[PDB]
Design a protein around this ligand. Structure first.
Ligand code: SLV
Ligand code: CL
Ligand code: CL
Ligand code: CL
Ligand code: CL
Ligand code: MG
Length: 347
């Protein structure tokens, strides 16, 4: 066990191993607080996150376990990984606090999109890396659920990592003119379907469109306005898809709208590479069964310059049976403690 030292930063106590030096606050959320630091063992600049109230309820304890399980599994060049996890506690009986350590990320794709002039080669490389990471995530039967520009880190060499997996966002967070909803698939925006991995491909289509034009694709002022923007571009549901729609709330509202045809994407995305237009038409489909998958998209001709089927790896299997398990707070807490003490750092 390393030696730990204590300090108070912005009214919070931080108790961390001596290896982490020069802690400086960089933000707070509802799930924790974050400090930048220098890691003397590896030489990296790191982000250290102290979870807030990790075991305050059954829901919160299960969420803490879920986050740690996910971060310990993800080992891929285009996905955020876990550098370290620690607790100052010396036993399960005194265990209360959890700290997570990752590489410190600078710019996100929002910063790139609003300030930089992107060539077609830039869009190719950025979307290629998203899809490479998504092939890996989906091969473990994980759904990201929250892909958007602020959850994609990008460095000076245009290299990209996927961040901030959806841990299961409030109704207030998705209300009104908010980027938190602009990238969500139409079948989940009003919970007309259960989540599945095809929702992430819709999000990729929205992101790629925004890199090509510099503008949000579906900036709705509320859920209904956003659905209308979507249906104007892709058309109202055809007979084949309506037959598959199980939700009675969806059918009733959908049938109240005048029918509209799918628009011509070459007249929407003026000047874009025709191969980019073709890929967008394969992502932005209402029938989620018919959307292109991440593995299929990597082989599309738009990525010919970067695609290498011997360098697009899949994940080890990921056991999610805990998600259907009913446990007490202290049982989730003990499971989390086991995962903290068994962590082995990357080479
Ligand atoms: C405006 C329609 C919203 C919607 C509702 C359901 C589905 N179902 C499938 C299987 O893809 C897909 C949808 O796009
Ligand atoms: Cl140390
Ligand atoms: Cl503790
Ligand atoms: Cl965003
Ligand atoms: Cl597993
Ligand atoms: Mg985020």
């Amino acid at each position: 066990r390393p030696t730990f030292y204590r300090q108070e930063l912005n009214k919070t106590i931080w108790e961390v191993p001596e290896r982490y030096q020069n802690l400086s606050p960089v933000g707070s959320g509802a799930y924790g607080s974050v400090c930048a630091a220098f890691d003397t063992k590896t030489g990296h600049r790191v982000a250290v996150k102290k979870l807030s109230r990790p075991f305050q309820s059954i829901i919160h304890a299960k969420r803490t376990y879920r986050e740690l399980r996910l971060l310990k599994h993800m080992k891929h060049e285009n996905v955020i990984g876990l550098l370290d996890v620690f607790t100052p506690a010396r036993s399960l009986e005194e265990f209360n606090d959890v700290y997570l350590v990752t590489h410190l990320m600078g710019a996100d794709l929002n910063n790139i999109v609003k300030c930089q002039k992107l060539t077609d080669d830039h869009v190719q490389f950025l979307i290629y890396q998203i899809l490479r990471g998504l092939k890996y995530i989906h091969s473990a039967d994980i759904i990201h659920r929250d892909l958007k520009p602020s959850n994609l880190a990008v460095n000076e060499d245009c290299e990209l990592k996927i961040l901030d997996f959806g841990l299961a966002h409030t109704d207030d967070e998705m209300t009104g003119y908010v980027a938190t909803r602009w990238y969500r698939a139409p079948e989940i925006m009003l919970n007309w379907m259960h989540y599945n991995q095809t929702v992430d491909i819709w999000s990729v289509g929205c992101i790629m469109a925004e890199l090509l034009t510099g503008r949000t694709l579906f900036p709705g002022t509320d859920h209904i306005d956003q659905l209308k923007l979507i249906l104007r571009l892709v058309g109202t549901p055809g007979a084949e898809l309506l037959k598959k729609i199980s939700s009675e709330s969806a059918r009733n509202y959908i049938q109240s709208l005048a029918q509209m045809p799918k628009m011509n994407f070459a007249n929407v995305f003026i000047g874009a590479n025709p191969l980019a237009v073709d890929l967008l038409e394969k992502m932005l489909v209402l029938d989620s069964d018919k959307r292109i998958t991440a593995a299929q998209a990597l082989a599309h001709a738009y990525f010919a310059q970067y695609h290498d089927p011997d360098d697009e790896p899949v994940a080890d299997p990921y056991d999610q049976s805990f998600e259907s398990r009913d446990l007490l707070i202290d049982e989730w807490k003990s499971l989390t403690y086991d995962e903290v003490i068994s962590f082995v750092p990357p080479p």
